[PDB]
Write a protein that holds these residues in place. Structure first.
Motif, PDB file in Angstrom:
ATOM      1  N   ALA A 185      22.352  54.857  22.901  1.00 22.69           N
ATOM      2  CA  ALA A 185      22.765  54.324  21.605  1.00 22.69           C
ATOM      3  C   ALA A 185      24.190  54.768  21.271  1.00 22.69           C
ATOM      4  O   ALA A 185      24.654  55.806  21.760  1.00 22.69           O
ATOM      5  N   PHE A 186      24.894  53.943  20.487  1.00 25.08           N
ATOM      6  CA  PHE A 186      26.267  54.179  20.060  1.00 25.08           C
ATOM      7  C   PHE A 186      26.560  53.479  18.736  1.00 25.08           C
ATOM      8  O   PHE A 186      25.817  52.578  18.339  1.00 25.08           O
ATOM      9  N   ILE A 224      24.902  44.753  33.676  1.00 27.50           N
ATOM     10  CA  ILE A 224      24.200  45.765  32.881  1.00 27.50           C
ATOM     11  C   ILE A 224      24.975  45.864  31.553  1.00 27.50           C
ATOM     12  O   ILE A 224      26.187  46.085  31.572  1.00 27.50           O
ATOM     13  N   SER A 225      24.283  45.609  30.425  1.00 29.11           N
ATOM     14  CA  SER A 225      24.863  45.577  29.084  1.00 29.11           C
ATOM     15  C   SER A 225      24.019  46.386  28.095  1.00 29.11           C
ATOM     16  O   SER A 225      22.831  46.115  27.936  1.00 29.11           O
ATOM     17  N   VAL A 226      24.637  47.361  27.410  1.00 30.63           N
ATOM     18  CA  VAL A 226      23.926  48.184  26.429  1.00 30.63           C
ATOM     19  C   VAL A 226      24.323  47.794  25.001  1.00 30.63           C
ATOM     20  O   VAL A 226      25.511  47.707  24.692  1.00 30.63           O
ATOM     21  N   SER A 227      23.317  47.529  24.152  1.00 29.98           N
ATOM     22  CA  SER A 227      23.492  47.166  22.746  1.00 29.98           C
ATOM     23  C   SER A 227      23.719  48.457  21.920  1.00 29.98           C
ATOM     24  O   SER A 227      23.336  49.540  22.399  1.00 29.98           O
ATOM     25  N   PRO A 228      24.316  48.383  20.687  1.00 26.98           N
ATOM     26  CA  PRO A 228      24.527  49.606  19.902  1.00 26.98           C
ATOM     27  C   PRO A 228      23.274  50.471  19.785  1.00 26.98           C
ATOM     28  O   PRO A 228      23.339  51.639  20.151  1.00 26.98           O
ATOM     29  N   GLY A 262      34.203  50.564  18.141  1.00 28.11           N
ATOM     30  CA  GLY A 262      34.975  49.328  18.217  1.00 28.11           C
ATOM     31  C   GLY A 262      34.298  48.291  19.088  1.00 28.11           C
ATOM     32  O   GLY A 262      34.150  47.141  18.666  1.00 28.11           O
ATOM     33  N   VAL A 263      33.884  48.697  20.321  1.00 28.45           N
ATOM     34  CA  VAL A 263      33.149  47.848  21.272  1.00 28.45           C
ATOM     35  C   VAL A 263      31.712  47.641  20.800  1.00 28.45           C
ATOM     36  O   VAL A 263      31.078  48.578  20.295  1.00 28.45           O
TER      37      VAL A 263
END
Ligand code: PLC
Ligand code: PLC
Ligand code: PLC
Ligand code: PLC
Ligand code: PLC
Ligand code: CL
Ligand code: CL
Ligand code: CL
Ligand code: CL
Ligand code: CL
Ligand code: NA
Ligand code: NA
Ligand code: NA
Ligand code: NA
Ligand code: NA
Ligand code: NA
Ligand code: XE
Ligand code: XE
Ligand code: XE
Ligand code: XE
Ligand code: XE
Ligand code: XE
Ligand code: XE
Ligand code: XE
Ligand code: XE
Ligand code: XE
Ligand code: XE
Ligand code: XE
Ligand code: XE
Ligand code: XE
Ligand code: XE
Ligand code: XE
Ligand code: XE
Ligand code: XE
Ligand code: XE
Ligand code: XE
Ligand code: XE
Ligand code: XE
Ligand code: XE
Ligand code: XE
Ligand code: XE
Ligand code: XE
Ligand code: XE
Ligand code: XE
Ligand code: XE
Ligand code: XE
Lengths: 311, 311, 311, 311, 311
Positions: free
Chosen positions: E49-50, E88-92, E56-57
């Motif tokens: 998580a971020f 491979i893509s990570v969501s917030p 920003g991203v």
């Protein structure tokens, strides 16, 4: 790593050699052959030059990753060559003597026109793409081009293995390309074809001609039809071991011609019977008697003509 | 890593051994066989020597990358052997004991002259190329050459597996190569050929000969032609399971000879009928009666001659 | 990485398990089968011990390269198993739970004597070679030996999949070897053979026997020859789906026997006609009438005998 | 590594080119072809821009791992392309010029409707997937799309190799995909089909028509049945070299039609004989005489109609 | 790397999707099909998580090695899938969106009972083994399950591609396993079978029945035997394109039944002739006349019965 820098403006001469270890799997339909061989590469790299007096060593051995190696490829391969580097040796002046053992499935077209009495020239095209910094040109070191004495290609006689010493240098996608032609001259072992296909096929054709000594329509029909079915079986068996050529082959021509002899035998057999029924056996007799001489004579002459045209 | 240095000027002796684990896929047409076996290599490397008291170990285990290992290859392989290193061990005096398990498709020519009663000698050629620093010679450790008791090659009897202890040392591209010959003697299981091909083929030929007890041209034509077609089917079936040899094979010779018996039967059958029509049955009778004894006798003698020539 | 140290002098026990996921491609000629399965391995390596208070986690997960793993191989494989490690779990005491999924082409000989009513026992031999520091012994964890309920082998019924719990520990090339026998009992689905080969082949044989109700030599010749050619086609079709065994198979025996019935029918047909021509139809009549009963009776008894011998 | 950042909001244009080196193995049943070719890609990466004066180089060479490279794939491939990077070159403005050599087995459906006189359009679909940061669009550099003059596809004539310059931009799994169509137009070399299949098949059909000049039922039966069996053999041989199409093919239609001619010949032969026996040969005479003209005429018309419908 | 920790005690839900790119090589005998497709995997990893406004991203792209990825396998594959990670893509919130493109040879059993008018359901079983830390469960994201519009399977019509949304969760070797069923419903294109096998086979059977309009034993023998040989050729050609099923197939049943019609024709032909010879042609006449109606009627009714039983 970068390529050797030119002293003036001269291109880098990469000396090549192919020593055939094994020759196998010549697929006629696929027009391919498998090869196991040594590939020797040699070029001068000044950056690798050393003093033999001070170093006490005559030759320095390197790992492929350690030094600059020219990207040599084969043109007419199915997939990239399975290669294993054997040795890399540098001389005091910087002449690198690279050696690798490879295996490849090579595509080389075949000329079936004189089959099964045909000879071929298999090709192995070595190619190097020139880099932006300096142009690369291929050369042949004849001392490093050869073949094992035990090299055997099943159903073929290996004549020669030579290289066309002058490379084909040409532009390709705005960069220079140096191509080399390694030629393997071979000739088919036609022996087996004689007792397996040719003679059986001739005997069955001659069996058909015994109908010229019979007046029994019933028996004649059986002869010509049967022997014809046997010929079809041979024609199929033959066409399975060969690719579909856009030209006539010698065997193909002969086989085709024989079909016409069967047709004319059927016509003779038919005409003879029609006449016999028509109560004209004396006329039928003349035709049958003529056929006895005509069929072998015309068959022999047709074959002489055919052989002349093909060879 | 570099090779062991010579104490004097002696070449490095690499002791070899092959222990056959699995033997399979003997392709007659391809003249190949697949093998799964252990390869053992042993050489003395002084640089690796150690004291057992100080080190506290009587043996030292290394990774292939860690120490110098001789580049051993197989001559007659299609592609490079699929190998997995089993163990590497150093004795206190520096005697390296290497072991690997491999699988390879080996090319070994076959002699079909006595087929299906032929015996073969399969070969595995081990080879080592010498390095600029020192010469490498191969040796056989007979204690490490063998085969599993369960090793079975389908349709073949495995006689022996031995190695020609004296290596074939020769020059190739100005470097010494040492070659070793591992020989696997095998003999074909000819059993199946008898009830499947030989006897059926003889039976159909004997059926053809019943035309010597018939005067019915139409029935005779049917016999000879039919049985001939059955013989063609057998000849094809046979040639599919064999490569095209530039020599005559025993089975091939027999098969070919039988074609001539069919031709002469057709001639007999033809002549008999011609004569019957010509109102000469007594003359045809003599020929047919002679044929009854002539065909079996000539067949038997021809076969004795053939068997004598081949064996 | 080195093997774990013994507490006393005991050998390292590597527990094994094979759980069959997929069974496919049972090649009869090749005597091979392809398998997709789980291979479980478990041993104690105290060097990997940990406190889950300090380390935080109750069970640690390692990469194959990180820890010592026993070199487990399959004896009867064509090439090395295509394996992908699923999990490596270490518990605080150092007990390793290795799980991997593999695919392999296994060579297991087949007994065709009772074909197509034969049953087989396929084998998978697990092997480990003992090192210098300590001997390695294999064990079977029966809780981890099994097969998927969906496991289907086309044209075969899968009976059982068990392991011979006691390993075959033996000397090999001066080192200890522990072998395990995983046995897969299967039985052929003979159903298709009946309407496809057996019954068609019997009907055509019975068609030949209608010549015992005919006096027409020409018609009889046609019957026996034709039906014989059909039998040859069946014999070929059968022998294509089977390897060349050095023994007689049930189907082979039957097929061979039928060839003799065809021979004797030809003889009968021949003798009958000879006698008819010889103006002895009453004698020919007795032989034909006897044949009507003799051929089925002798066929039935010969089959009872054959089935008794084979089963 | 990350993709190049947009100056405004424009997508990343990757300029493509395919230069065919080798074309081989066009499997008709599989509807596949193998290809060996150059793939040349070019995009602008500002992050890699440089001044020629301070750098002292007009061009910069990189390793694939060092810089960002677009993930270009082929849609219609069996497995992922066997690729080997040839050269990566960066110009002062950051114009990356990538080149790789690949080999692939491409699936492209074939239209057998006009077989063996059919022409095909083989396809190679290039595809790129757009990322979350920016949209990636494919372009064709016509200067870098071509083929070797020596490119030969066995049994086929290579007409053209072009690319549909406008890419098919569409969504797939919530990301944009840019597709490019490389088309290879080819036409079958129908030559071999004429002397191998077409003419033999016609001759055997014409042999059956000789029964219109015979009153011998037994001889007629033999003609039509035999010739029919030969036609079946041809029909099988043909259908082995072709896939099962859900539509009628030209060869298929002809072959099928010929089966009807054989049926009607059997009927004629049957009716003629029935009438002959029924003591009505004058009526049978009319039918046979009509058939002599009817069969070739109706055959020729049937073929004109068929050729019209297909071409 | 370790798996994501549970918030409570809930299992990790991995959302799956399969998008078929290419379908090819449906082997009937092998009961296999080759597939080229996209595999999508999605799961929440809170550790990843971020913040969106801070970072920003909106989306972060990771390399497979960098983050934890669930070990997803296919149950019914020959070997492990040839896979290449696409994105491979990570969501917030930490939701991972993994995508890979794969190719696999899938084993899915086929039901030949209604062949060549059969429909199949091909399966792709997705499986995940749970870890010691937490249980893993599979889910279907229907938005990510699909197929290309161009997807063509030669000789087959593709109906649907769906997934059984409820996973089969079960215990296996003391650990939890979650299985998913991806079903591809297809129906055979039976068109080609009609002009290639069915109609030719019927025509030859009808040719046999012309013997009911003939009194010529010799001609009748030739008809029934010939047509029978043609039927055997068809029966063989058919059984070559099909595996050995332990059940009767529709085509198999028909083919078998036809053999009985040939047997009874032989009997009729035999009885007729015996009676003719026995100077009882009037009785033979009744049987032959009855057969003319009986054979077609019984053939038609037997076929209606058979079609009813199979469909
Ligand atoms: C039925 C027809 C029978 C075929 C006869 C062989 C054709 C032929 O005569 O073939 C000739 C080839 C040799 O050809 P070459 O030297 O490669 O050709 C190049 C020659 N030029 C450059 C002069 C044109 O083989 C032979 O030595 C013939 C032996 C085979 C005899 C088999 C008889 C049965
Ligand atoms: C008609 C054709 C019938 C073929 C007859 C077999 C040929 C033969 O007699 O074959 C002989 C071979 C044995 O050969 P060996 O030990 O390799 O020879 C080495 C011997 N020297 C060195 C003296 C030359 O087979 C056998 O054991 C014979 C059994 C086959 C019987 C088949 C019956 C039909
Ligand atoms: C022509 C000859 C026809 C062949 C007849 C079948 C041979 C047979 O009788 O086969 C027998 C096998 C059973 O085999 P099992 O369980 O392995 O025997 C082990 C038995 N012991 C341990 C006592 C030896 O099949 C059957 O159940 C019979 C079904 C086949 C019917 C085919 C009809 C035609
Ligand atoms: C008996 C049946 C004989 C078959 C005859 C050939 C069919 C045909 O006429 O084939 C035609 C094709 C060429 O056709 P194309 O350019 O693809 O068609 C485009 C046609 N439009 C534009 C009209 C739609 O082949 C040929 O050059 C014919 C030579 C082969 C003759 C063999 C005769 C024996
Ligand atoms: C002599 C043998 C002649 C074979 C006749 C076809 C068998 C049949 O009648 O087949 C039937 C299938 C239709 O099947 P369906 O709707 O998928 O089955 C599911 C049906 N339920 C749900 C009702 C059970 O095929 C056809 O469309 C027949 C067209 C082929 C005709 C060829 C004639 C020659
Ligand atoms: Cl290459
Ligand atoms: Cl090797
Ligand atoms: Cl293994
Ligand atoms: Cl790709
Ligand atoms: Cl998988
Ligand atoms: Na390098
Ligand atoms: Na080394
Ligand atoms: Na390890
Ligand atoms: Na990159
Ligand atoms: Na990872
Ligand atoms: Na006849
Ligand atoms: Xe070559
Ligand atoms: Xe030939
Ligand atoms: Xe023949
Ligand atoms: Xe020839
Ligand atoms: Xe004829
Ligand atoms: Xe002629
Ligand atoms: Xe060997
Ligand atoms: Xe043989
Ligand atoms: Xe025969
Ligand atoms: Xe033989
Ligand atoms: Xe003959
Ligand atoms: Xe003879
Ligand atoms: Xe097994
Ligand atoms: Xe069988
Ligand atoms: Xe038959
Ligand atoms: Xe059997
Ligand atoms: Xe006979
Ligand atoms: Xe008998
Ligand atoms: Xe293409
Ligand atoms: Xe054709
Ligand atoms: Xe024919
Ligand atoms: Xe055609
Ligand atoms: Xe007919
Ligand atoms: Xe017609
Ligand atoms: Xe699927
Ligand atoms: Xe037929
Ligand atoms: Xe069918
Ligand atoms: Xe059918
Ligand atoms: Xe018959
Ligand atoms: Xe019937």
């Amino acid at each position: 790593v970068s390529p050797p820098p030119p002293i003036a403006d001269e291109p880098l001469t990469v000396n090549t050699g192919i020593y055939l270890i094994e020759c196998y799997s010549l697929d006629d339909k696929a027009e391919t052959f498998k090869v196991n061989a040594f590939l020797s590469l040699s070029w001068k790299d000044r950056r690798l030059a050393f003093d033999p007096v001070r170093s006490g060593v005559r030759v320095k051995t390197y790992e492929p990753e350690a030094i600059w190696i020219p990207e040599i490829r084969f043109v007419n391969v199915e997939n990239a060559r399975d290669a294993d580097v054997v040795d890399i040796s540098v001389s005091p002046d910087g002449t690198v003597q690279y050696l690798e053992r490879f295996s490849a499935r090579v595509l080389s077209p075949l000329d079936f026109r004189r089959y099964p009495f045909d000879s071929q020239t298999l090709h192995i095209y070595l190619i190097v793409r020139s880099v932006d910094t300096r142009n690369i040109v291929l050369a042949v070191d004849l001392e490093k081009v050869g073949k094992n004495d035990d090299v055997f290609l099943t159903g073929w006689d290996i004549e020669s293995f030579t290289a066309v010493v002058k490379p084909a240098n040409f532009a390709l996608e705005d960069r220079l390309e140096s191509k080399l032609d390694y030629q393997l001259r071979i000739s088919r072992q036609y022996f087996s074809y004689i007792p397996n296909i040719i003679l059986p096929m001739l005997f069955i054709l001659f069996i058909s001609w015994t109908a010229f000594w019979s007046t029994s329509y019933e028996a004649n029909v059986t002869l010509v039809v049967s022997t014809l079915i046997a010929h079809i079986a041979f024609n199929i068996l033959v066409e399975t071991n060969l690719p579909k050529t856009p030209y006539m082959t010698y065997t193909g021509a002969i086989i085709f011609m024989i079909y016409l002899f069967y047709f004319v035998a059927v016509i003779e057999v038919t005409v003879q019977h029609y006449l016999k029924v028509e109560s004209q056996p004396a006329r039928a007799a003349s035709i049958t008697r003529a056929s006895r001489i005509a069929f072998p004579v015309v068959f022999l002459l047709a074959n002489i003509i055919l052989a002349f045209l093909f060879f």
